């Protein structure tokens, strides 16, 4: 049957849509919410959302494709966004990636066998003074050492 | 309860934008009000919109977002056009080294909201927007909750403090396009479309959000507004040099002992920023070069320049990335090339191919896989990104890298071999 949103999701989506003066302005908050729920943007989920937004599907797809943050390719509970830009690279992005490889056994762009962690190479995260920087979903941290990183990641279950 | 944020070091000599934000925690409305907050708003709502515009103009407040456009004048241009109008606070950061705006948003959200309300009232906007990057979730939730705080204290909503002025502030989110920081693209995203900039003119202050006069202003710009109203434009123009007056946030990063955001006046030298305030270099290694975000490159011989918007001044957003004698200038330029590779939106052909190929060939140069044609090609591509570009990204993608070829040729020659 027609794919449909769980009500604990559809409630939030409906809230986002009513937040702005025009429904269409909600598209990015809906996608953030959809990816937060599913661990990725299910292709199946865009048709219902287009209806919800009173926008064409091809518009919605075109938007998903354009924005780096949205992934319709790979599922992951937790996205380790690793900053690879100028400052983080100078201050030891590599030692962070090395530690991530050692602990999780995956390189940038890859997902752990349990689909728990995906490492995502991103541009500057806006905490250059706390370099090298990474996020674990919404949580943002300075990398200090492998032992320090191992402890943080233990907090994600 | 908000997500984890690293506690960037903050230090001020003026005790204005960072008076609260120097302490690395959320300051909620009762604290803001206790430092006399929203009193500038009360004062402003008892002046006419036109007189606020005058004060902001006489202040000499300039855009903090990298344009250095005189803020008072931007507002004048907005209000020449018929209402209704919209005020947008550019919460998008993206540019590397730049983390000044996040410490206002995350620590003193109310300074920003007060700024947005006064500025909105000045241009007669009854609807305002904060477009905050998606990599700032804490800032998103902190702004949403802090706006709710302002609503309940009756600073937002309809007929605010019996003034007759209506304002809602809406918080939209990015999803990882840098170009969404360029003011026309930001509006395209707010309208629920791809972050593709518009051909100018029309300019936003004439045709912007749904073709209505639109003021887009940087987080740091809007943060200055309450001070101008509260202190008076005379007392504000007294801070630092009269021609580029007021407090400035300098995000300092790289090989310095005390990296963080510094609130200084703009007659501070780039040497003062690094060595007096930022506590000098790591290992006291000689400074090699300073990168002004992804915009410019200054050598160790240009440290004596003011941090103001003047021609021979530092300018930009006041972003200071410090490299020492032991840092590869080429490897650095590669990482600036790779930034512009990712963040060209691909509308304009020289920019789309130029930004990508610059990075592709420089990567080959850096790895010692470059043919002599890839070298000649890298050089040509770099000087041919600007042509046809309808926004500043194409104009600047090759700028920094060119300066490094000019100022450090010996280090680039190491890579020719
Ligand atoms: C490609 C590009 C990206 C930009 N990104 C940002 C940004 O992240 N933040 C910002 O405040 N201004 C950014 N700007 C500058 C804006 O075009 C504009 O100058 C600014 O939003 C106006 O604020 P101001 O008057 O306070 O300077 C960018 C400009 C361009 C061309
Ligand atoms: S110059 Fe580059 S980033 Fe700017 S609109 Fe053209 S293609 Fe997009
Ligand atoms: S360079 Fe990594 S956060 Fe900016
Ligand atoms: Cl104040
Ligand atoms: Na964005």
Numbering used by the authors:
A (entry chain A): 4 to 160
B (entry chain B): 3 to 419
Q: What does the publication say?
A:
Complex I couples the transfer of two electrons from NADH to ubiquinone (Q) with the translocation of four protons across the membrane. The L-shaped complex is structured into a peripheral arm that protrudes into the aqueous milieu and catalyzes electron transfer with one FMN and 8–10 iron–sulfur ([Fe–S]) clusters, and a membrane arm embedded in the lipid bilayer that mediates proton translocation. We have determined structures of the electron-input module of complex I from the hyperthermophilic bacterium Aquifex aeolicus, encompassing subunits NuoE and NuoF that contain the FMN cofactor, the [4Fe–4S] cluster N3, and the [2Fe–2S] cluster N1a, respectively, both in the air-oxidized and dithionite-reduced states at resolutions up to 1.8 Å. Here, we show that the redox state of N1a regulates NADH oxidation in complex I by inducing a conformational change close to the NADH-binding site.
To ensure that the methionine residue at the homologous position in the E. coli complex does not change the local structure, we generated, purified, and crystallized the A. aeolicus S96MF variant. The mutation did not impose any substantial structural changes, although the hydroxyl group of the original S96 is no longer available for hydrogen bonding to the peptide carbonyl of D94. In addition, the larger side chain of the methionine residue displaces two water molecules, while another water molecule shows up in a different position.
